[PDB]
Amino acid sequence: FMSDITVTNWAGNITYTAKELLRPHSLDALRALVADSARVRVLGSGHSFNEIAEPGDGGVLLSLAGLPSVVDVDTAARTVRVGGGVRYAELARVVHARGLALPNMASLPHISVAGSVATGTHGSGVGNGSLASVVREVELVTADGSTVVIARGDERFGGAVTSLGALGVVTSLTLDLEPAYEMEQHVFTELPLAGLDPATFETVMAAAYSVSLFTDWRAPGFRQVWLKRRTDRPLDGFPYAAPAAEKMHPVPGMPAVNCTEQFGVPGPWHERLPHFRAEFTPSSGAELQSEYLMPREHALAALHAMDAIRETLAPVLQTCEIRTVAADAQWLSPAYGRDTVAAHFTWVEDTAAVLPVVRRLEEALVPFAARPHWGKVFTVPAGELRALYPRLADFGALAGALDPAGKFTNAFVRGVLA
Ligand SMILES: *Cc1cc2c(cc1C)N(S(=O)(=O)O)[C@@H]1C(=O)NC(=O)N=C1N2C[C@H](O)[C@H](O)[C@H](O)COP(=O)(O)OP(=O)(O)OC[C@H]1O[C@@H](n2cnc3c(N)ncnc32)[C@H](O)[C@@H]1O
Numbered sequence: 001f002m003s004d005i006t007v008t009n010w011a012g013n014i015t016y017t018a019k020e021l022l023r024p025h026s027l028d029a030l031r032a033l034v035a036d037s038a039r040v041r042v043l044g045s046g047h048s049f050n051e052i053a054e055p056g057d058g059g060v061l062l063s064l065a066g067l068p069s070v071v072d073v074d075t076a077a078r079t080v081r082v083g084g085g086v087r088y089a090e091l092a093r094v095v096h097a098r099g100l101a102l103p104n105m106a107s108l109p110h111i112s113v114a115g116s117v118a119t120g121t122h123g124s125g126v127g128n129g130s131l132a133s134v135v136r137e138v139e140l141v142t143a144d145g146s147t148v149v150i151a152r153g154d155e156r157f158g159g160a161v162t163s164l165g166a167l168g169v170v171t172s173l174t175l176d177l178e179p180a181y182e183m184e185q186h187v188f189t190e191l192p193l194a195g196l197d198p199a200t201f202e203t204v205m206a207a208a209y210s211v212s213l214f215t216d217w218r219a220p221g222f223r224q225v226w227l228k229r230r231t232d233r234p235l236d237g238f239p240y241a242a243p244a245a246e247k248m249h250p251v252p253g254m255p256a257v258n259c260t261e262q263f264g265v266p267g268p269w270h271e272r273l274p275h276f277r278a279e280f281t282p283s284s285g286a287e288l289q290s291e292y293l294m295p296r297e298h299a300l301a302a303l304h305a306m307d308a309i310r311e312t313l314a315p316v317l318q319t320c321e322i323r324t325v326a327a328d329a330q331w332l333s334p335a336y337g338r339d340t341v342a343a344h345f346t347w348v349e350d351t352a353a354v355l356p357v358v359r360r361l362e363e364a365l366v367p368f369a370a371r372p373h374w375g376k377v378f379t380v381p382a383g384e385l386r387a388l389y390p391r392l393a394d395f396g397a398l399a400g401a402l403d404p405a406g407k408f409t410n411a412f413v414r415g416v417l418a
């Protein structure tokens, strides 16, 4: 019973120093556990790829998995209060049953709400904010075990949602909702980079509510374009690429059965926004990930930089996805303060092969003020990274106020707060 267990992240490339994952079965136990522990980090669903959740030797790694997972919809207010351990699959199911919906979802629904918003998680769409952007309140169990509630309108709120878990344990969050809506998902193959000029690029990325490009960085250009269209908006013709003949997966060769329905068949928002169907339930994945988030105005220049080193990127690549994100108010969001283009890389799980490629890619993106996704693999030096966040000092002041001893600051966060 009392023997050491090995705790890892989802992909298994990160092994935590913790010999047990503490799962308090009451809020009273959680408050006592936090108050009584010298250093704490929280584990969500483990879909980070780096040491963000690592509490260091002697540090406590805790989870909310032992507490009831509550999803409490207020239909009249169009809000939902959700436990921080609730995953988006369940959140979406429950709000949909109440006739309501989120404006966006990530690619795969089986990821915790608190863990997702902690790092700047997003989907696509030029007018769609990050997942954090719909949060209107957070409830934190702070270093001494007491609760602090921070709501939109509070001067502190800009640092309170996407906080890298550095303010305390987010026990619940409240999110704003809109009426449930229907969508169609239309996939296309072969969009050239040649002739993808500023106007065409803008048109393509704005052609539906959420648009992604996929490429293997092998033949020039893009292998796929995914349009997730709301049925309550116009769909113009899309001459720029060929309509897909078969159901597609982001990663060539992987099973398209795993993916959400295509060929433009209408279905509910939560069955179209993710790339992956709720029924697909992998307990781990053999992949690494990196993603770089840049000012949207640099999209073509960045894409051209990548194209120039495509022979370097391809050998260790499963797939690359290009997305857009609306400017984020959250101080630590990689989309902070600016409309954003994101370039995501799903790598083969070969750390030694991938790291040199990551470094080369980062060098290529320096001219475009690229901020890495906090949950993914990156090697941007700490000082250079701090320089990319205008309101970092404001964030550090907030963390200092809520957690003066840095109970929730680990090595990962310490590099950011330095
Ligand atoms: C594994 C995976 C990852 C995502 C994607 C696909 C899957 C297979 N894609 S992608 O397109 O393939 O990249 C996502 C996407 O579509 N959009 C994205 O922006 N990101 C993609 N990711 C991202 C993955 O979303 C994340 O990196 C997340 O952070 C979501 O979080 P998890 O809960 O799974 O992660 P951790 O357990 O590692 O926690 C992350 C951080 O947040 C903390 N945390 C967790 N719970 C809490 C609470 N309750 N309170 C305070 N802090 C909390 C951790 O301490 C850690 O710092």
Ligand SMILES: [Cl-]
Binding pocket: 191, 192, 193, 194, 220, 221, 222
């Ligand atoms: Cl091309």
